[PDB]
Amino acid sequence: GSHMNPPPPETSNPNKPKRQTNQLQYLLRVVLKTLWKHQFAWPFQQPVDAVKLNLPDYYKIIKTPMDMGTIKKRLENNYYWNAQECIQDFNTMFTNCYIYNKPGDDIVLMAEALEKLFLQKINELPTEE
Ligand SMILES: COc1cc(Br)ccc1CO
Numbered sequence: 001g002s003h004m005n006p007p008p009p010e011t012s013n014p015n016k017p018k019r020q021t022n023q024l025q026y027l028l029r030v031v032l033k034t035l036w037k038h039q040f041a042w043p044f045q046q047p048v049d050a051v052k053l054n055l056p057d058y059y060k061i062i063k064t065p066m067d068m069g070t071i072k073k074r075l076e077n078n079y080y081w082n083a084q085e086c087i088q089d090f091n092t093m094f095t096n097c098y099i100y101n102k103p104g105d106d107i108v109l110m111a112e113a114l115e116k117l118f119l120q121k122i123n124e125l126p127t128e129e
Contacts, residue, residue: 001049001051002049002051004050004051004056005047005048005049005050005051005059006059006065008047008065008070009047009065009066009070010079011070011073011074011077011079012077012079013079016079016081017081018078018079018080018081019078019080019081019082020078021082021083021128022126022128022129023082023083023125023126023128024075024078024080024082024083024086026083026125026126027075027083027086027087027125028075028076030121031090031118031121031122032068032071032072032075034117034121035068035114035117035118036068036072038113038114038117040109040110040111040113040114041068041114043107043110044067044068044093044110044111044114045067045068045069046067046069047065047067047069047070048062048065048067048096058100061099061100062096062099062100064092064096065096066089066090066092066093066096067093068090068093070089071086071089071090071093074086074089083125083128087122090118093111094111094114094115094118097111098111
């Protein structure tokens with residue numbers, strides 16, 4: 001895309017050790033699947049394109065970008081060692097939205113709806129085994 005957007009977060013690196021866990025499987029099959037199909041998922045399904053959205057300060061403010069397009073890739077092409085890394089990615093995505101935008105803005109209400117669903121699913125994250 002545009003040279004004025006940063007490269008996306010890393011999704012492939014052979015030097016990072018990888019592992020499947022039952023918790024990572026649940027994050028893909030239950031958590032990502034549930035959030036991806038939510039009515040309010042679409043702004044979160046790919047990196048923020050600050051050029052297209054005319055947000056020239058976005059990547060001045062947000063230095064830890066994350067989105068569910070990247071998380072989907074990290075899950076589908078097993079990037080992670082543990083579920084905590086993937087849960088942190090989700091939490092980063094939500095916090096980016098809450099830091100950049102005014103409380104009560106549409107995009108914040110959308111993120112908050114996804115986060116409510118996310119928390120319900122993470123409360124049932126299975127015991128690792
Ligand atoms: C996911 O972040 C988005 C998405 C849309 Br659409 C509009 C603005 C922002 C910045 O928070």
